[PDB]
Amino acid sequence: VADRLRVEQSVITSLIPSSLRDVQVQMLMSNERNALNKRPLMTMLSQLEYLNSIDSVFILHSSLMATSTDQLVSAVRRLPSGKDSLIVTMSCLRALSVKSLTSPSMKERIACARALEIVSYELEKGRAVLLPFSEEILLHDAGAYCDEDLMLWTVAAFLARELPLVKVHTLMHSNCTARTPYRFLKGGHNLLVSSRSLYDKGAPLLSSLHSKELRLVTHNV
Amino acid sequence: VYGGSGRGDLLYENPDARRHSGRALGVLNGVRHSSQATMPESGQLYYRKLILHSRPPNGSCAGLQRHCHDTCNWSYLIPSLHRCAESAISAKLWEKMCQLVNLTQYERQRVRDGQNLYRYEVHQRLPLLEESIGWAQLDDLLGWFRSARRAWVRLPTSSSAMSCRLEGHADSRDTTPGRNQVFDTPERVEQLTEATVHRIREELQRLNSARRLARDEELSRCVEEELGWHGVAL
Amino acid sequence: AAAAAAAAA
Amino acid sequence: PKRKKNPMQLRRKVYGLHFKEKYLKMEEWYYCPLCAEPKKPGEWCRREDCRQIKP
Amino acid sequence: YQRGGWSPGSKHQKHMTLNPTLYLYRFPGPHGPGPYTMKYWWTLGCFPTGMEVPFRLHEFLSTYQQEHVPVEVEEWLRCYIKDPLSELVNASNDFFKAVEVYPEVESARGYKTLQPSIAPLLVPMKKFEEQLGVKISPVGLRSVLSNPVLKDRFLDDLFDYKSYVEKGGSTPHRRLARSRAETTADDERSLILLLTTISEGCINAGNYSDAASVLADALMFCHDPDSQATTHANISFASLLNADFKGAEYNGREAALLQPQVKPTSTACARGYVGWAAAAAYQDDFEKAEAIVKDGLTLYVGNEHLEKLANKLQALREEQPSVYKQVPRSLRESRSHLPSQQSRGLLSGSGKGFSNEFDWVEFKNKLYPSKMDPRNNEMGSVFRRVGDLGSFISTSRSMER
Numbered sequence: 067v068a069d070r071l072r073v074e075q076s077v078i079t080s081l082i083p084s085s086l087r088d089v090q091v092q093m094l095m096s097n098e099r100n101a102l103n104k105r106p107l108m109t110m111l112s113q114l115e116y117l118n119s120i121d122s123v124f125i126l127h128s129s130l131m132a133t134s135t136d137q138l139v140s141a142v143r144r145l146p147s148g149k150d151s152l153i154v155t156m157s158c159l160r161a162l163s164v165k166s167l168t169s170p171s172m173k174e175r176i177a178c179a180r181a182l183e184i185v186s187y188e189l190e191k192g193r194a195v196l197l198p199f200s201e202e203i204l205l206h207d208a209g210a211y212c213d214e215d216l217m218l219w220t221v222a223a224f225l226a227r228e229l230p231l232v233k234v235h236t237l238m239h240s241n242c243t244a245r246t247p248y249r250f251l252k253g254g255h256n257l258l259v260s261s262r263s264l265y266d267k268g269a270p271l272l273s274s275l276h277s278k279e280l281r282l283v284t285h286n287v
Numbered sequence: 288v289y290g291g292s293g294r295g296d297l298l299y300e301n302p303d304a305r306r307h308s309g310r311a312l313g314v315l316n317g318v319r320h321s322s323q324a325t326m327p328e329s330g331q332l333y334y335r336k337l338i339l340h341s342r343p344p345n346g347s348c349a350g351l352q353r354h355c356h357d358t359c360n361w362s363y364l365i366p367s368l369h370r371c372a373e374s375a376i377s378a379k380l381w382e383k384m385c386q387l388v389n390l391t392q393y394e395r396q397r398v399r400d401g402q403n404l405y406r407y408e409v410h411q412r413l414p415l416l417e418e419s420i421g422w423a424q425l426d427d428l429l430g431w432f433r434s435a436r437r438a439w440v441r442l443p444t445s446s447s448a449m450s451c452r453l454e455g456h457a458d459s460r461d462t463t464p465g466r467n468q469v470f471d472t473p474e475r476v477e478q479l480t481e482a483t484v485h486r487i488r489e490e491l492q493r494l495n496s497a498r499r500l501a502r503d504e505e506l507s508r509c510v511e512e513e514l515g516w517h518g519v520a521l
Numbered sequence: 522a523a524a525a526a527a528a529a530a
Numbered sequence: 531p532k533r534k535k536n537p538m539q540l541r542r543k544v545y546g547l548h549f550k551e552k553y554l555k556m557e558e559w560y561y562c563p564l565c566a567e568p569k570k571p572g573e574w575c576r577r578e579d580c581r582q583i584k585p
Numbered sequence: 586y587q588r589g590g591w592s593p594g595s596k597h598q599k600h601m602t603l604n605p606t607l608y609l610y611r612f613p614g615p616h617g618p619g620p621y622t623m624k625y626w627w628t629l630g631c632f633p634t635g636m637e638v639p640f641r642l643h644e645f646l647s648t649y650q651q652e653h654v655p656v657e658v659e660e661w662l663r664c665y666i667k668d669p670l671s672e673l674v675n676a677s678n679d680f681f682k683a684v685e686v687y688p689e690v691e692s693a694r695g696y697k698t699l700q701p702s703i704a705p706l707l708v709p710m711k712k713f714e715e716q717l718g719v720k721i722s723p724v725g726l727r728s729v730l731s732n733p734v735l736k737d738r739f740l741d742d743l744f745d746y747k748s749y750v751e752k753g754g755s756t757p758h759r760r761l762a763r764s765r766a767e768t769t770a771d772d773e774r775s776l777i778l779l780l781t782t783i784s785e786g787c788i789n790a791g792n793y794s795d796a797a798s799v800l801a802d803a804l805m806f807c808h809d810p811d812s813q814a815t816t817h818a819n820i821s822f823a824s825l826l827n828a829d830f831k832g833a834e835y836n837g838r839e840a841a842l843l844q845p846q847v848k849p850t851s852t853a854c855a856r857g858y859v860g861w862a863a864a865a866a867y868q869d870d871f872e873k874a875e876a877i878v879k880d881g882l883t884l885y886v887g888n889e890h891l892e893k894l895a896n897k898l899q900a901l902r903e904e905q906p907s908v909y910k911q912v913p914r915s916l917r918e919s920r921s922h923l924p925s926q927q928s929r930g931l932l933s934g935s936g937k938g939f940s941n942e943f944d945w946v947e948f949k950n951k952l953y954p955s956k957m958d959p960r961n962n963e964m965g966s967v968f969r970r971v972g973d974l975g976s977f978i979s980t981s982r983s984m985e986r
């Protein structure tokens with residue numbers, strides 16, 4: 067997948083849009099242009115239109131495979147339906163690799179290695195979606211540090227703000243603290259954020275952490 | 288789009304319109320504010336998202352626990368088109384047309400309806416076929432050509448039904464995002480035809496006992512006759 | 522030459 | 531026998547422990563080495579070998 | 586007094602004065618007849634109340650009108666039955682087409698791809714089974730098609746069978762007509778090979794009973810001594826895996842008896858000896874197993890299977906001194922060790938609280954309560970409470986009976 071991404075980087079960069087807001091407006095304008103008279107690697111920003119067409123989107127998380135890969139196997143089984151998509155992040159892959167190479171639990175290590183293999187195969191076949199580090203830079207807030215959890219929640223907030231009709235589920239371990247962003251991932255009482263900052267196009271994506279609306283629109287399944 | 292017809296679904300369903308209902312809706316499951324009693328604000332992206340995602344999983348969609356179906360598989364998409372053509376045109380009529388323009392008005396209208404239905408089905412299945420080109424199979428691509436022939440639609444290789452785009456002024460067409468509309472249907476179908484021809488060529492090159500000899504002979508004869516009928520070579 | 526039939530005539 | 535109950539008032543019993551012990555219990559078992567049937571420890575068959583030696 | 590509706594279907598209580606009613610023991614409800622009323626319908630012929638009017642017009646139409654046929658039509662239908670040879674040829678053609686068009690499994694990395702369901706293969710399989718008098722296992726076919734090598738070894742055999750049948754050869758039909766002697770023909774050999782491939786797929790899947798049945802059908806078809814020996818060896822192995830020791834031993838003995846009719850190059854005789862020895866070992870007769878292995882070695886010295894089995898028996902013999910003898914003749918078969926035996930016990934095992942000797946007892950063809958069981962006059966048996974019908978006292982005890 068690394069070699070494929072390097073080969074197909076130019077197409078991905080050309081297809082990635084300039085602005086990440088008013089995505090619905092941009093899609094409508096593209097549709098109007100089309101109405102008026104091969105396949106590269108699938109990534110979120112280049113394939114936003116594909117994601118918009120898709121009905122369900124599962125965001126992968128490293129903690130999901132703390133013990134077994136059954137849930138990831140279920141997600142990839144759901145993938146070929148054509149109506150569902152899977153989103154994996156570079157931060158998620160990094161977390162999987164580091165915890166497979168360092169976690170004291172042998173079950174966790176083997177499960178994470180198997181998950182890496184499965185994700186690699188799915189990306190190779192193109193049925194999955196990848197969010198490289200460059201796209202993470204483009205998407206994440208201006209000057210916000212993002213780990214796996216923060217990157218996952220920024221992706222969820224972007225999908226909920228620019229592609230509302232796509233139903234966003236999150237695959238993660240029930241013990242993970244990222245399941246409740248407004249309870250654990252919160253920057254304190256900030257006067258510049260409110261419950262409507264999720265829908266505020268100009269506001270940073272992470273402002274949605276302070277409110278339950280992000281959790282309202284994102285389902286942990 | 289979650290609870291209703293999605294990407295490759297054939298059934299046309301307007302989720303906002305309460306069609307296919309025997310009751311006047313009294314309770315709206317997806318409600319965010321009490322004001323939505325008299326101002327539901329349906330159509331707005333966020334509230335419509337809430338309502339549609341609150342809708343239960345119908346037959347088209349599948350629950351998170353129920354095992355889904357690989358609808359995006361070429362080996363399933365092609366036989367779907369073949370079955371569509373078979374249902375549209377009866378075996379007797381297909382045999383009569385192959386033997387043979389002297390046809391009954393009912394039979395002519397049946398053929399036209401079959402061609403229209405096949406075109407609509409191709410339009411609906413186009414994204415799935417495009418996604419499944421990569422891992423398709425030679426038998427299924429030959430079946431694609433056979434299904435087109437049976438439906439009697441000549442693919443636009445550059446009667447004929449794909450070559451002419453559907454009527455409608457560009458200022459009124461449904462350009463709304465999230466709906467799998469293919470405005471450039473003839474161009475997309477021509478690209479798909481070229482891609483499947485190239486895929487067949489690659490599969491034959493990769494492939495290059497009595498059973499296997501006979502299989503190769505029949506496959507070559509089929510490929511030849513079907514491509515000749517559709518106006519393609521190699 | 523006879524068989525048991527459910528109904529006759 | 532004085533007032534109707536609501537779903538949560540009915541679900542109090544499943545919240546309790548007696549309901550779980552009476553209804554929601556899983557039995558631990560194993561395959562008998564002799565008859566190869568599911569078997570719970572402490573209970574055996576009437577076969578001669580089972581009676582003589584009790585798996 | 587009156588609390589609910591006046592109709593009998595109303596729930597709450599009523600009183601005789603206000604809402605007098607007839608004695609309706611049990612009648613259907615608002616949502617249609619229930620299982621209890623339908624049991625009454627089938628047993629007594631009408632609902633227990635008796636006020637209902639029996640009405641089985643639909644049942645009559647389903648059964649009697651459908652099965653009614655006049656004498657002349659019944660006589661001419663047999664003569665107008667279809668052509669068996671052409672029907673078999675068409676069945677083989679469509680079955681081969683369906684198998685060939687069956688998609689190949691994608692070899693995914695990191696997990697096991699689900700094998701595509703076989704929807705269109707069943708009807709061709711059903712007609713092929715009907716025509717050939719054989720029964721193919723859907724699980725076996727699924728496994729054969731999923732495996733790439735087995736898929737080719739099945740397709741080639743099926744194509745050969747089709748070619749030889751189209752060439753005018755129907756060995757089973759010709760043999761049956763002649764019987765109404767020779768050796769196995771090419772068509773019959775191809776059919777046997779196809780059935781053996783299906784059985785191998787069944788064994789790979791884990792359906793040893795289906796494998797054994799398919800191999801038994803193949804044995805029925807075959808007539809050559811070498812084919813008989815090979816099929817007997819295969820059936821013995823299948824029965825060993827399926828936990829059918831008597832069948833395994835019988836098939837192994839038959840193969841070892843057919844040994845002389847087979848050429849030296851074949852190994853079916855050694856396979857049959859190995860199967861017989863394994864059946865003896867599972868029956869826990871180590872002396873018999875060792876003797877059989879010794880005979881097999883004396884026959885074919887150097888056989889890998891015989892050497893492996895001899896080594897295993899030697900290890901068991903070295904372990905035996907711990908017991909100082911063999912398993913006592915008292916049990917001689919008690920221990921169960923096969924996954925097939927475990928599955929059989931899970932399925933047909935007498936469950937706790939039902940399907941036991943205390944829940945229902947199966948008489949000749951009927952279900953009885955434990956108290957009416959004619960196999961034991963236990964303390965819960967009605968037979969105990971009878972005694973001294975009038976002929977003679979019949980028992981010394983003088984307290985009951």
Ligand code: FES
Pocket residue numbers: 561562563564565566567568569573574575577580
């Ligand atoms: S064999 Fe299992 S209880 Fe006796």
